[PDB]
Design a protein around this motif. Structure first.
Motif, PDB file in Angstrom:
ATOM      1  N   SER D 198       0.844  -1.189   0.000  1.00 58.39           N
ATOM      2  CA  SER D 198       0.000   0.000   0.000  1.00 58.39           C
ATOM      3  C   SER D 198       0.873   1.230   0.000  1.00 58.39           C
ATOM      4  O   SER D 198       2.079   1.150   0.216  1.00 58.39           O
ATOM      5  CB  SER D 198      -0.803   0.027   1.277  1.00 58.39           C
ATOM      6  N   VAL D 250      -3.944  -5.841  -1.362  1.00 57.76           N
ATOM      7  CA  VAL D 250      -3.973  -4.865  -2.445  1.00 57.76           C
ATOM      8  C   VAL D 250      -3.786  -5.630  -3.758  1.00 57.76           C
ATOM      9  O   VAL D 250      -2.787  -6.345  -3.915  1.00 57.76           O
ATOM     10  CB  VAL D 250      -2.880  -3.792  -2.284  1.00 57.76           C
ATOM     11  N   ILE D 341      -7.635   3.181 -17.970  1.00 65.83           N
ATOM     12  CA  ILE D 341      -7.936   2.584 -16.667  1.00 65.83           C
ATOM     13  C   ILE D 341      -9.435   2.653 -16.367  1.00 65.83           C
ATOM     14  O   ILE D 341     -10.020   3.735 -16.344  1.00 65.83           O
ATOM     15  CB  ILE D 341      -7.134   3.207 -15.521  1.00 65.83           C
ATOM     16  N   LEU D 342     -10.037   1.484 -16.134  1.00 63.05           N
ATOM     17  CA  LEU D 342     -11.483   1.351 -15.974  1.00 63.05           C
ATOM     18  C   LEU D 342     -11.850   0.811 -14.609  1.00 63.05           C
ATOM     19  O   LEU D 342     -10.984   0.577 -13.761  1.00 63.05           O
ATOM     20  CB  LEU D 342     -12.020   0.300 -16.943  1.00 63.05           C
ATOM     21  N   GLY D 343     -13.160   0.601 -14.444  1.00 63.39           N
ATOM     22  CA  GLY D 343     -13.728  -0.317 -13.475  1.00 63.39           C
ATOM     23  C   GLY D 343     -13.295  -0.121 -12.054  1.00 63.39           C
ATOM     24  O   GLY D 343     -13.141   1.003 -11.578  1.00 63.39           O
ATOM     25  N   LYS D 344     -13.069  -1.239 -11.384  1.00 63.03           N
ATOM     26  CA  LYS D 344     -12.727  -1.239  -9.980  1.00 63.03           C
ATOM     27  C   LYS D 344     -11.371  -0.615  -9.689  1.00 63.03           C
ATOM     28  O   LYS D 344     -11.200   0.014  -8.657  1.00 63.03           O
ATOM     29  CB  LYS D 344     -12.787  -2.666  -9.450  1.00 63.03           C
ATOM     30  N   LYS D 346     -10.082   1.944 -11.283  1.00 65.43           N
ATOM     31  CA  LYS D 346     -10.350   3.373 -11.325  1.00 65.43           C
ATOM     32  C   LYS D 346     -10.926   3.879 -10.002  1.00 65.43           C
ATOM     33  O   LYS D 346     -10.447   4.872  -9.450  1.00 65.43           O
ATOM     34  CB  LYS D 346     -11.289   3.713 -12.487  1.00 65.43           C
ATOM     35  N   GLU D 347     -11.947   3.180  -9.504  1.00 62.63           N
ATOM     36  CA  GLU D 347     -12.582   3.526  -8.234  1.00 62.63           C
ATOM     37  C   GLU D 347     -11.595   3.443  -7.084  1.00 62.63           C
ATOM     38  O   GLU D 347     -11.566   4.323  -6.234  1.00 62.63           O
ATOM     39  CB  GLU D 347     -13.800   2.649  -7.968  1.00 62.63           C
ATOM     40  N   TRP D 348     -10.778   2.393  -7.073  1.00 65.31           N
ATOM     41  CA  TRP D 348      -9.703   2.261  -6.103  1.00 65.31           C
ATOM     42  C   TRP D 348      -8.805   3.499  -6.081  1.00 65.31           C
ATOM     43  O   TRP D 348      -8.645   4.134  -5.044  1.00 65.31           O
ATOM     44  CB  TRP D 348      -8.860   1.016  -6.367  1.00 65.31           C
ATOM     45  N   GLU D 350      -9.301   6.536  -7.338  1.00 69.03           N
ATOM     46  CA  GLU D 350     -10.023   7.760  -7.007  1.00 69.03           C
ATOM     47  C   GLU D 350     -10.220   7.913  -5.507  1.00 69.03           C
ATOM     48  O   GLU D 350      -9.923   8.957  -4.933  1.00 69.03           O
ATOM     49  CB  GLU D 350     -11.371   7.795  -7.692  1.00 69.03           C
ATOM     50  N   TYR D 351     -10.697   6.863  -4.860  1.00 68.47           N
ATOM     51  CA  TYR D 351     -10.860   6.909  -3.426  1.00 68.47           C
ATOM     52  C   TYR D 351      -9.534   7.113  -2.670  1.00 68.47           C
ATOM     53  O   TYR D 351      -9.478   7.809  -1.660  1.00 68.47           O
ATOM     54  CB  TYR D 351     -11.542   5.642  -2.929  1.00 68.47           C
ATOM     55  N   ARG D 352      -8.474   6.488  -3.161  1.00 71.81           N
ATOM     56  CA  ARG D 352      -7.195   6.540  -2.487  1.00 71.81           C
ATOM     57  C   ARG D 352      -6.409   7.843  -2.730  1.00 71.81           C
ATOM     58  O   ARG D 352      -5.269   7.974  -2.284  1.00 71.81           O
ATOM     59  CB  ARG D 352      -6.393   5.297  -2.841  1.00 71.81           C
ATOM     60  N   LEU D 356      -5.632  11.091 -11.308  1.00 74.83           N
ATOM     61  CA  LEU D 356      -5.284  10.428 -12.569  1.00 74.83           C
ATOM     62  C   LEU D 356      -4.393  11.264 -13.483  1.00 74.83           C
ATOM     63  O   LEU D 356      -3.560  10.718 -14.208  1.00 74.83           O
ATOM     64  CB  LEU D 356      -6.510   9.907 -13.302  1.00 74.83           C
TER      65      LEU D 356
END
Ligand SMILES: Cc1cc2c(cc1C)N(C[C@H](O)[C@H](O)[C@H](O)COP(=O)(O)O)c1[nH]c(=O)[nH]c(=O)c1N2
Ligand SMILES: Cc1cc2c(cc1C)N(C[C@H](O)[C@H](O)[C@H](O)COP(=O)(O)O)c1[nH]c(=O)[nH]c(=O)c1N2
Ligand SMILES: Cc1cc2c(cc1C)N(C[C@H](O)[C@H](O)[C@H](O)COP(=O)(O)O)c1[nH]c(=O)[nH]c(=O)c1N2
Ligand SMILES: Cc1cc2c(cc1C)N(C[C@H](O)[C@H](O)[C@H](O)COP(=O)(O)O)c1[nH]c(=O)[nH]c(=O)c1N2
Ligand code: DMA
Ligand code: DMA
Ligand code: DMA
Ligand code: DMA
Ligand SMILES: [Mg+2]
Ligand SMILES: [Mg+2]
Ligand SMILES: [Mg+2]
Ligand SMILES: [Mg+2]
Lengths: 364, 364, 364, 364
Positions: D198, D250, D341-344, D346-348, D350-352, D356
């Motif tokens: 991480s 991770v 970069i897509l999907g999960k 991308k969400e990972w 963004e939250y972290r 981008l």
């Protein structure tokens, strides 16, 4: 007869397909960030935390379930005596039945006999507050088990599809609750029963002085499903309607966010579909102060005392593993460890106006 | 011979696989926020609402379906007599056939005989306005059942794949409609037929003075599917083309958002795949004034009068359950209750320029 | 033996499982907004459009496929004679084989004999430009079928996994192309072959004077899959590597967006997995000037002349249905009709810097 | 006993279902943008790159696995001798066993005998640094195989569920590491073992002078799964707990982003579920300097020397194909090629807090 409902409840919950039936906790959308270098040793992890005036061994409680008859009381005995051994708090099931019939008072009293030191939490339903329960009934329930607090349950979803339900939640019941807290010696927890607490409900309750919540979100025991089954059982036509509402409610994880966000200083139990120490850890990390379980405790207790000790051992270990692997030395560290929020939970929070940045601040 | 199409329609809709075939309402993307403390009692929930000049018992209507022959009229009789009993409004099917052949006038007239007080809504197809229907044909259809309003249906998708379809929607038909509203004694509703109303179509219709819409979105009865079946049945080559368009259209939920947003002061019926009181509640909460159903009403009416009464009972109860559990004492409260919008519906709205904040304002 | 590859190609493409194998066009992420009131009649829809200096009946082309031997030429004859009848342009397969062996010149020449008026498009591979093809070979290919334009194909993916592939794409081949366009009497189209054109590739090609592109994205004929099969067939070890690249490439829809966005004034064919008039409509609406098809045309042509006429009839009808139902009177209106972009396509565009607002402007 | 764990590890990893069991690399969420015009020839692609002071043929390493006994050493021999032939670096398994028992020293020493020129990387576990390992044990492990660097592994997840695990990661072990780097002749790499690094862990390690990381993310060999199996095997109750953590960690792709972003100037190995040259290319393109593999190398080595040469040939070819098709002439170009970069994933990100835009800058 209400004692019949009591056995039916336990019987359906334990042996029928109602755990997470068509519902979801959204806990899959919560990820604890692994720390390859934890910075701690496993054996120095400390799981102790406060539960009102007492101290508990683990940030987990058994939430209320049953009582009102003999085989129900001997379940309560197994749960309480194991709970005592592990230093974890225990709520009892609704005590309505013990106010109504005095023969039922034993199945609740056994709990304090066999668990003298852990916090015990009393239980009465919100609809009773509209149907003439007041300060004295509350004091009865409390001192009947020497309760350290009382849980007032919200179950309008259940009451609606119940064959015999009393779906009455007039605002005046909150004025009464607020008055009862005036002169109660112990704090009140307001908990749901499988359908979750929203931020509108939490804010309302808070505005009447309630500071302790228990999410009891969807994705665990499905009470709409249980009443559907009771309905099917007596060819009551409501059965099919209930089927359409099987996924009604706030998913547990969403509820934890919602309550924590809308009432930041709350004491919050995260419950509804907690099935592992991992689930418990996520709930605490997400914003809960402690995690609550009901159904899996019932299922073990039915199998016997040692079965339930094995269960609590498993939960505790799982929790400590989650703490270990996030570098959380104690419960406070877990409460502010790094998480990722994805998927449907993210969309839920975004729409509901939960600012992810100000949220991160609030949970620490 | 057009009376043959009339029976085929009913026969395929009732007995073949066409409900939601490859289509979706997007209503799964709409969640009503559960309120653990409703603040009301179930029995004080009031489901009454206005339907133009009349008052109706429930915010639900039966949308137009059939008529034109005898067994079709006796279905219309069952629907209307039960609709009367429950105080819910009823649209009849297209009355073209009753303007063309006078023997068909009975299968529509029966409705007002057996339902003297509820709103009855007449029905004529938009393509007829290009093919020389005018003020008098409208007045005929209206006073033939003492209609409280007339629905003009949009079905270009259906006409395209129909073996015998008339896919003509010249703009001039709107000038004519606008002129017919000049001197009609009752209001006009413009409704789709399974493929939904977009914001371009709504805005256009509004610019010609139309203020009442019925979404009839995809995800319910699939009219492209029905005509595909009629095509397969006569080895018409269009069958395979129809197969490629099975999921063409605006999903109901998207349509409700689109119409409400683009024409805020509209009277809006949310229809197309409403199958439970829950679905009805979502549609109303989302932005509709009332919810509309066709297919499930047909299916019950075919089984008999009491079957249909059982159905309306189930719908009504489901609706009241949704209201109860969102703390909605009446239809107005439901219209402004808390919702979550997820998934594909969210993406749909975002792309289409529907600002979620200004949307929340508009629905209340 | 290169004529053997030619038969193998056709044989595998026609009879083996390679259409959309592990690949996707992303066209599911494109939705045409239905218009309940089209504002036009079906029979007044006009599908005519320009194709360089000529006019074509429909905004669809048959993209290049085959030739080089006799049964290959009689396929080319069926395709071309039907294409003539419908007024739609046709590309031929790579003419390398006809420059190498003069016996193969007939299987391409037949096309102009049987299709005197429609645009015919010649074909040569980019790798030939590094291997010593120049102005004269281009002129040969062109005047061998009296071509109205020449397509130069990009197939590096295919060449890589080809047992016998020539994967050489040195930049110098572009200088040469640019020089060949100096003195060619007809325009050059640069097309891919199942793996799509990116915005880096388009911009590069544009910077060398290329203005006409053919997306040929993934999700249609899977050329990596075809070569995998040829590899399996001769126990060539590359087979397994090819398996890992089965979903390599730019999905057709993404490619259309990318090319249109990066080179706004381009003439753009949207091809790669177009299988219905609906697909064709989406591609055009999305940003293409015309839609291209290969594989489904081959499959019908193999079955016979009338089979292929039935196919073109179906495509045309489907296209006009899509136009009808979006209120598009002509191809220009379709190019600016309302769309929704969802899902993976949306994420693709966002990451790639395609501003959705400025994109909407560019496609109109 | 510990040499038994060594065989069990290899045996379970090779022959049981533990590769990607309930875990994901998120590499599906990473797409390399295809370039229809690469601008290079396949044979001019240069795959050479630096590995500390040495130069390697391919940007791929074999990460540490085994040693400690004879059949384990003959695996190490096959791996090393093939690694030498291909010019790719090789890590050995944990050398604890060779410090403890001198008979085990041979199964590691064989590696340098048979691979004189490639980089060889030593291996010791972080928990040993708390249990009294220091400068001399490190120097032993290093000069026992003439190592060019030493890998210190992080495995707290594994140690937790290990029947015999030592889950001790006190901060003081880093002070010690930092001191050992004072006077070590070679660099230290810190690597995980299936659960990923991480940004908190990377930053911490960096703050103690560590500059070289190896992601070893989830989605490859599942070490929690391996220990679950060892637990099941001796009816150890931890087995069921491990089952709940099967997807802990991770994901590799997320880890590569996290480390690159949080420590931009790091030397980064991207490992954990790399199974093809395509996977290797994605990892490098994403932000890794080189890609690492373990399990698939083991599996081939067990089958024999030529089996493993065939494997490296396949990997290398796949990598070059990916490079070819992105127009990457060398490793540096691949490191800055275009991605989606897509999907999960991308969400990972963004939250972290992974911006981008600033990320795209950092990876070049
Ligand atoms: C048999 C049985 C009976 C009851 C319950 C549970 C079970 C299984 N629960 C609800 C419980 O406390 C909890 O909020 C929900 O069940 C969600 O938690 P689980 O998913 O069961 O862990 C409960 N709650 C309450 O406040 N009063 C009650 O008397 C009962 N009754
Ligand atoms: C047998 C039958 C026949 C008709 C219909 C329906 C059915 C099932 N509906 C369409 C109906 O009013 C409604 O808009 C759609 O069917 C979507 O609603 P449901 O999904 O059926 O609830 C309809 N609509 C209309 O305006 N004129 C018509 O005559 C008919 N015909
Ligand atoms: C049998 C066969 C052979 C060829 C092709 C196709 C088929 C099926 N295509 C590729 C074609 O033009 C198109 O770009 C892709 O096949 C994607 O379109 P479809 O998915 O087939 O509609 C093609 N392209 C080209 O430029 N030169 C060639 O000679 C051929 N060869
Ligand atoms: C049999 C075996 C044994 C070991 C490993 C692997 C295998 C399969 N790996 C972990 C390895 O280096 C790598 O980080 C993970 O396995 C993820 O990579 P793959 O998914 O295996 O490619 C490893 N790591 C390490 O640092 N010290 C060790 O001694 C071992 N032991
Ligand atoms: C989950 C839950 C709240 C169960 C008790 O409900 P109930 O209405 O059967 O009990 P009581 O009527 O005693 O509150
Ligand atoms: C859903 C709907 C409008 C059905 C009637 O279509 P139709 O073409 O049979 O009606 P009409 O009798 O008006 O042509
Ligand atoms: C899809 C496509 C471009 C096919 C022709 O490839 P090929 O290498 O067989 O043809 P040529 O050798 O004529 O380039
Ligand atoms: C994946 C990995 C690190 C395997 C070795 O673990 P181990 O605990 O057996 O190592 P050691 O021999 O250092 O304890
Ligand atoms: Mg109750
Ligand atoms: Mg009609
Ligand atoms: Mg070629
Ligand atoms: Mg160890």
């Amino acid at each position: 007869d209400i004692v019949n409902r009591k056995v039916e409840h336990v019987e359906i919950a334990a042996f029928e397909n109602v755990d997470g039936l068509s519902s979801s906790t959204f806990l899959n959308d919560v990820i604890l960030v692994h720390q390859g270098f934890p910075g701690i040793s496993f054996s120095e992890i400390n799981t102790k935390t406060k539960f009102f005036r007492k101290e508990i061994s683990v940030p987990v409680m058994v939430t209320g379930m049953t009582g009102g008859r003999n085989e129900l009381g001997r379940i309560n005995k197994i749960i309480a005596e194991v709970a005592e051994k592990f230093g974890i708090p225990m709520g009892v099931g609704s005590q309505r039945v013990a106010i109504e019939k005095a023969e039922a008072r034993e199945s609740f009293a056994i709990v304090r006999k066999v668990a003298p030191t852990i916090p015990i939490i009393a239980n009465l339903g919100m609809p009773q507050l509209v149907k003439g329960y007041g300060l004295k009934e509350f004091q009865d329930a409390i001192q009947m088990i020497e309760a350290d607090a009382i849980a007032v349950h919200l179950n309008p979803a259940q009451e609606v599809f119940q064959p015999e339900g009393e779906p009455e939640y007039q605002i005046y019941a909150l004025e009464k609750l607020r008055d009862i807290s005036k002169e109660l010696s112990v704090p009140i927890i307001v908990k749901e029963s499988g359908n979750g607490i929203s931020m509108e409900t939490a804010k309302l309750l808070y505005s009447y002085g309630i500071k302790n919540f228990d999410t009891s979100g969807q994705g665990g025991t499905n009470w709409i499903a249980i009443e559907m089954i009771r309905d099917i059982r007596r060819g009551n036509w409501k059965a099919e309607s209930a089927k359409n509402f099987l996924d009604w409610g706030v998913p547990t994880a969403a509820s934890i966010m919602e309550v924590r966000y809308s009432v930041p200083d709350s004491f919050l139990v995260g419950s509804g579909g907690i099935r592992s120490g991992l689930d418990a850890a996520k709930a605490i990390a997400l914003g809960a102060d402690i995690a609550g379980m009901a159904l899996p405790v019932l299922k073990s207790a039915i199998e016997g005392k040692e079965s339930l000790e094995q269960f609590f051992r498993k939960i505790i270990f799982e929790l400590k593993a989650a703490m270990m692997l996030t570098g959380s030395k104690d419960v406070d560290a877990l409460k502010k460890t790094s998480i990722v929020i994805l998927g449907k939970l993210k969309e839920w929070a975004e729409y509901r106006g939960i600012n992810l940045s100000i949220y991160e601040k609030v949970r620490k």
